[PDB]
Amino acid sequence: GPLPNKLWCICRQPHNNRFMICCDLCEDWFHGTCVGVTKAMGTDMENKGIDWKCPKCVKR
């Protein structure tokens, strides 16, 4: 993408064309790898309307 130095996730690394998901409390994006979510899992959650939270927000 046009902002290769833009950081995401708990790891503060770029997108790098990796699968990412969005926390519905903080609205940041997270690499699936870093938060333990595969593409199939994330797609299933999106289909079911599961309000997935990142590791910081899930404790709130």
Tell me the binding residues for Zn(2+). Answer: 9, 11, 23, 26, 31, 34, 54, 57
Q: Sign (positive/negative) of CA torsion 28, 32, 36, 39?
A: positive
Residue 50 within binding range of Zn ion, rule CB under 5 A: no
Number of residues near Zn ion (by CB under 5 A)? 9
> Which phi and psi (to 5°) does residue 30 adopt?
-135, 135
Residue 23 within binding range of Zn ion, rule CB under 5 A: yes
The H or E element that residue 32 is part of is helix 32-35
Residues of this chain that interact with Zn ion (CB under 5 A) are 9, 11, 23, 25-26, 31, 34, 54, 57
